[PDB]
Subunit: 408 residues, 3 copies
Amino acid sequence: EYPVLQKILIGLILGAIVGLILGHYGYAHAVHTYVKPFGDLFVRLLCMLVMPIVFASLVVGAASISPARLGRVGVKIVVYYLLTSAFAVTLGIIMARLFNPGAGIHLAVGGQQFQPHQAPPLVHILLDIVPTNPFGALANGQVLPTIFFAIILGIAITYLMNSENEKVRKSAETLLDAINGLAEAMYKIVNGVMQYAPIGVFALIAYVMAEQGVHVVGELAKVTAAVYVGLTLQILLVYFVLLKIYGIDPISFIKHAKDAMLTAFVTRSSSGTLPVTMRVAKEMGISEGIYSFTLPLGATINMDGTALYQGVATFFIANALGSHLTVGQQLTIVLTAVLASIGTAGVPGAGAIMLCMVLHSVGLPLTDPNVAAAYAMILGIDAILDMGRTMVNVTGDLTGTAIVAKTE
Amino acid sequence: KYIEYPVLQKILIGLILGAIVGLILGHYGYAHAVHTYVKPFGDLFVRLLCMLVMPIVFASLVVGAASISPARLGRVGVKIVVYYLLTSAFAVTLGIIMARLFNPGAGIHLAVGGQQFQPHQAPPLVHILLDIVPTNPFGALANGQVLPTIFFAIILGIAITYLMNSENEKVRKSAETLLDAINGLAEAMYKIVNGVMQYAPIGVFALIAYVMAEQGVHVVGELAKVTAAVYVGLTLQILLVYFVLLKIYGIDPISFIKHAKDAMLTAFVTRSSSGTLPVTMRVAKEMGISEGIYSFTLPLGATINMDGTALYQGVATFFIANALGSHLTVGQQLTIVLTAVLASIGTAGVPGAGAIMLCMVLHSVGLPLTDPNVAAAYAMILGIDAILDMGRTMVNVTGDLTGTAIVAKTEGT
Amino acid sequence: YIEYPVLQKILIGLILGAIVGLILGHYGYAHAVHTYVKPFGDLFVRLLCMLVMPIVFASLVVGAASISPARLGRVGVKIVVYYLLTSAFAVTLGIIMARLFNPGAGIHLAVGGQQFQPHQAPPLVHILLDIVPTNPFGALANGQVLPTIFFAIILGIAITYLMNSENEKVRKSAETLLDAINGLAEAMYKIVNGVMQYAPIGVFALIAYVMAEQGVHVVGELAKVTAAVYVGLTLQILLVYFVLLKIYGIDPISFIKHAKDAMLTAFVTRSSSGTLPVTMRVAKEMGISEGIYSFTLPLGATINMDGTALYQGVATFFIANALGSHLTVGQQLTIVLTAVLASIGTAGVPGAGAIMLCMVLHSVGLPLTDPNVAAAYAMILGIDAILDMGRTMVNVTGDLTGTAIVAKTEGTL
Ligand SMILES: [Hg+2]
Ligand SMILES: [Hg+2]
Ligand SMILES: [Hg+2]
Ligand SMILES: [Tl+]
Ligand SMILES: [Tl+]
Ligand SMILES: [Tl+]
Ligand SMILES: [Tl+]
Ligand SMILES: [Tl+]
Ligand SMILES: [Tl+]
């Protein structure tokens, strides 16, 4: 009934208190049997949409970047985001190694530590990106095959919208229209769930605090910190550089963006903030014909915010499970995540949904008590992380639409 | 060789002829020969039905959620929705009441494999509730999870509507398309049922032929037991609730029926809420309901009218369970029944929805249709579904008019 | 750039590949190829058996809708009857030529070091009842061919009946679902084109292995296949088309003289759709009514079954024969008739001949994962390119043959 972000922070701050004192001389168990299931309900509602959004999303996403259905002003802004995600990934990993979130918290939940099962011959792991039956991939949660098929579909659809046959061209138009809309419904459903999130988020940390000790809160602050420093380090180290390098003034640029960022910071919605963003791009004096096209893109294809979230969440999730992870695997894991997140920029809680999808793609079964309880930690603090996530997404959309505006 | 012939006649001929053939082949006949030869024609029939059980429940619920969905729901609409909810309320109670009043099922104690069916029971409440949320909705759909499919089709249908309330025309057209295509699938699945009802006379023949030949003559009384339980609760609904609702709204019940008289008799003989809808609207005009009212509210009851199904399930549930051996309590009765009705929204008619829902409710309550008992128990009701489905639709239509008349008179604007 | 003529690419990959393979076979390292080269071929085979499900399904829904009565126009009904009575003959030639050359025996593959063993086969009741999908989403989800076929027809036909409805809500909904299912189908074809781009690499790796490992025997066994097709192929044009034209007072000699490049385009483009512009312009040169060829040509592009019928005839026989199992005339057609009867809507489509094979094997229970089945299919898939040129060339010749026969019955020459 009331401001949804307030609700989640209230449930979090209140929940960690309740959990923590109930932890000390309380009954970690009673929480586990009674409180926690409300939390589990929450985590179920999210993992639910993990499949439809990943697939429907990527079909739309592929079609968005798809050549040469891609316009010429478009091709440049795409090139922009690729070379920004580039840096946004490096920062992610760097900050994730810089703060070491996860080690320190050594979860062995069943009273047995989680043991990563590994891993078939390169041949078989590559071959198996190609879904043997795409309905089946989709049906029983194969991530890599769904990704591969949703790109190969999305790109194909666009080629059909370049056909002589209007029977053909309308058909494609229809399919894609319908796949979108599914995607679009899946998002509306996230909004709905975020409504339950304050109860759900409550129940989650309540348990984690009551059961994992007080150590966690420092481990989570470890996460939050690693994101937010990388986050501002992105704006400063890359955006300001790109603006400066294009004769735009970084200081006064921020002065216009100032509330467009603050809106994103508080609405979490790249789409919800889009009205405010476009109005500021007009204040900055970007061509109408430019920002009305390139801003609607960053709202969806902006990959840089998610790239920073995954960088850290990946590393913490894995680190806490026990498995110390190398730089190679870090990006392999991360690049995969970001490369499937295209089309999902905001979307309220995308950062967390992608995490689920990446774990399900790297084989870690969410049903295993450790994986679950590890994930459940980040899912608690997702709210906070998701504010910076969107805020940087928006800042980099303007930065891009401004750089590309100027070249026209 | 054209079966261009009245399809209801066909099924009743298939039924009354079939039970004779079966019954005499039973007495000094060869229950077995029937079982190996005649029955598979019956099983083909039961397959064609349980086929559509998944697409129609899903695609149907998406459309139905979207139809009741707020605030996409118009204000004339919101009152008629409230109507059907408080009528299904009563329709359910009568269902259970009549199902306990006649005791269909006990008396017939089927142990078909030569072993009695044994309900397997049941995970911790936590786990049964959590598992209503599909972990992967494609998967729910793919391998038949009922409760997760229900849950997802509602959460989808509602969401779609909210998208048709968007600024973004990209978004608004997208939603419109998806929902358009989900409908139409629903709509096609219905057209497929009509097709199957065409085979129903042969299939319904082979089904009771076996049941009679093998289950004794006890069945025909047990089935009359069902038919009765429905038809008495059925008319007891019209009298006890509709007439009270009309009387309570200054509408005259006696003269109301006098207009509805053929509109009901059409439904009773067409089994189709949609097929009868033309006749119904013309009678709503005879009763002098506003054009802008009945041309909206009647197309809804044709789909969302839940009261007829509520009575079918009430009795079929109790019989199917009772015959299996398991004596069922009043809590479970409605738990089971409310479930069924609440997923049957959007499926009013549809020729044989009564039977389809039964199959879906069983698959939802864990009873595997592959087990010989559950199968041979369902195969009984599926025979007589035809008869029951005439009263089902007739009451559906009577209560659509009752509703659209009660709501009409609260307007006149 | 791999943008160079795609057919050249594949023949270069084939002729080069067989050399490389074969010499690497003799004193080479059949094994090295197996571990390193072959996986590139396997990636190819995967990419194909990938789309086998969506195309069969989405394709048959479209196909059903295209022949569906009485949505079928009257000029249409005669052309449909034409292709049915030509597929009739095309099947017989298929089998005849497959028996006449004996492709397969001579190559006795036992790959694991154990020969493949056809597992057989449930009671006729169970194999027939199981054509009806218990849950159609599941059929689709886990590869069930026969159920997918059955449901895709029963859906496509139904959708068309809905486009004959009074209710525009209904008639648009159907129009949408069918529109969307199309496009999916249409996308799946675009995806094949994409794969054929990788085909030169993939095809190289496939025969490279087969030659290196299966001996030099194969090339003769494959020439055996190519021949059987191409002789049956031309024997179709001569024995049936020319007889049909002659029988309708059209002159076969001068008919060919117009079709001459329209066939040569098809022979070189492999696409019934790609060649369709050329075809229509030639139908105009032959002086067919504009309103006739602009309708009937677009059909044979998709429903022409006669080319595929000849491919399956021979591929079936070889594939089974090589596995070890000697196959009778009954089974031959049972297997083949099935294949052709699901292939409606898939005329071209670049590599449909091979995709249908995979689908017929998955329908007849032979698991593509078994190393023999796999290595046997992997042989035809190599030479598919060659076969597929004659496939489309005969498809086109017979579309013209039909549209000219049907044209003249309207008195539109
Ligand atoms: Hg998840
Ligand atoms: Hg069923
Ligand atoms: Hg295959
Ligand atoms: Tl994105
Ligand atoms: Tl976000
Ligand atoms: Tl209903
Ligand atoms: Tl009915
Ligand atoms: Tl075809
Ligand atoms: Tl072809």
